[PDB]
Ligand binder design. Structure first.
Ligand SMILES: CCC1(CC)CC(=O)N([C@@H]2CCOc3ccc(C(=O)N[C@H]4CC(C)(C)Oc5ccccc54)cc32)C(=N)N1
Ligand SMILES: *[C@@H]1O[C@H](CO)[C@@H](O)[C@H](O)[C@H]1NC(C)=O
Length: 338
């Protein structure tokens, strides 16, 4: 049995889907993140302005909510903001499928702890939560992650999911347990996941046009729906900004200005995945920018390259296959439909 969960592309970068929590059920619209594993829900215990503007789950109105003991609020700090809150368990429902006794994080503050003077991601978006879809290694608290708990309680669902991203129409969809040829064109190329925390596969080479920028050290590609942009390590970013400059542009001449920009080629052994200038240049205000940011995923000697939603999944249908005993963990990539 296979089912799907449609996603609404919001005015911010978000692709949110319907999620029901508690008894009687309350409705929240979280994003679905392959770059984290916790489940976060914005609650009424967060009285901040960036919280009060959205639908807030109230645990006091849930007969099935249970409070978990913690010594301190768990604090998650990342690039553009911070999430902080407590933890409990409740019963969830996603696409009419039931997940009971699921541990999740209750957002109680969105204060930015990188630089507390402004620049907070939650001021610019209508954030209601995160459904983590990564591997159990990244679970911060609780007995079992959300997706695994869904499968344990729905054993006729196959441990896999996939994302069709099309921001222009309303056909953006998350499908759980399978795929559909109604989304991709051609074949699906499989890449083994070698690091079961993120959805992380090995990257062999990376070209910006004809210039080879990777790899001389061990490099990896992370498929992360929870970022709009693609990323590169700091070292390659100085090179990237010298080969791909941002320029002024308009909606009228952008095809003309990007005629000279290079093709970005991601090489996975035999598979070559190309990014054309109109597929990685973002247009905001009157500036054509590369849809790339600088992220150094922490590790001793590994380098991680992230593939985001706006720049990658919009053009490439992506399948995530959880490993079992009859198969390993892989990600599948195919061209998307028009
Ligand atoms: C969701 C954040 C976390 C989980 C706590 C942590 C985390 O840092 N990342 C990545 C990997 C590292 O680099 C970055 C850098 C930036 C961003 C970012 O600002 N993302 C935006 C996208 C948008 C506006 C559509 O929705 C939301 C909704 C909430 C928060 C952020 C966003 C994400 C990541 C996750 N993949 N997941
Ligand atoms: C729910 O999960 C908790 C772990 O947080 C566990 O102690 C409990 O036995 C589980 N089942 C029920 C019915 O609470």
């Amino acid at each position: 049995n296979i089912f799907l969960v449609p996603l609404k592309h919001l005015r911010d970068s978000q692709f949110v889907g319907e999620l029901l929590v508690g008894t009687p059920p309350q409705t929240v619209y979280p994003i679905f993140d392959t770059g984290s594993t916790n489940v976060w829900v914005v609650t009424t215990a967060c009285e901040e302005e960036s919280c009060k503007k959205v639908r807030r789950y109230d645990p006091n109105k849930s007969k099935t909510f249970r409070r978990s003991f913690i010594e301190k609020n768990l604090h998650i700090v990342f690039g553009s903001g911070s999430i902080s809150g407590s933890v409990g368990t409740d019963t969830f429902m996603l696409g009419k499928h039931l997940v009971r006794n699921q541990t999740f994080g209750l957002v109680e503050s969105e204060s930015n702890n990188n630089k507390n003077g402004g620049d907070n991601i939650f001021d610019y978006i209508s954030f209601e939560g995160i459904v983590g879809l990564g591997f159990p290694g990244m679970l911060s608290a609780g007995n079992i992650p959300f997706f695994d708990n869904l499968l344990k309680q729905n054993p006729n669902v196959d441990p896999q999911f996939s994302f069709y991203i099309s921001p222009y129409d309303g056909k953006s969809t998350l499908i759980i347990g399978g795929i559909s040829k109604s989304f991709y064109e051609g074949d699906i190329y499989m890449l083994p996941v070698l690091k079961e925390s993120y959805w992380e596969v090995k990257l062999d080479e990376l070209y910006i046009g004809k210039e080879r920028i990777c790899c001389d050290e061990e490099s990896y590609v992370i498929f992360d729906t929870g970022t709009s942009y693609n990323t590169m390590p700091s070292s390659q970013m100085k090179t990237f900004l010298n080969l791909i400059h941002s320029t002024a542009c308009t909606e009228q001449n952008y095809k003309d200005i990007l005629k000279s920009y290079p093709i970005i080629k991601y090489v996975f052994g035999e598979l070559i995945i190309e990014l054309h200038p109109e597929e990685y240049m973002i247009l905001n205000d009157d500036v054509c920018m590369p849809a790339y940011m600088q992220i150094d995923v922490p590790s001793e000697r590994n380098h991680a390259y992230l593939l985001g939603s706006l720049s990658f999944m919009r053009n490439f249908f992506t399948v995530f296959v959880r490993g079992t005993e009859s198969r390993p963990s892989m990600v599948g990539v195919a061209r998307a439909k028009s």
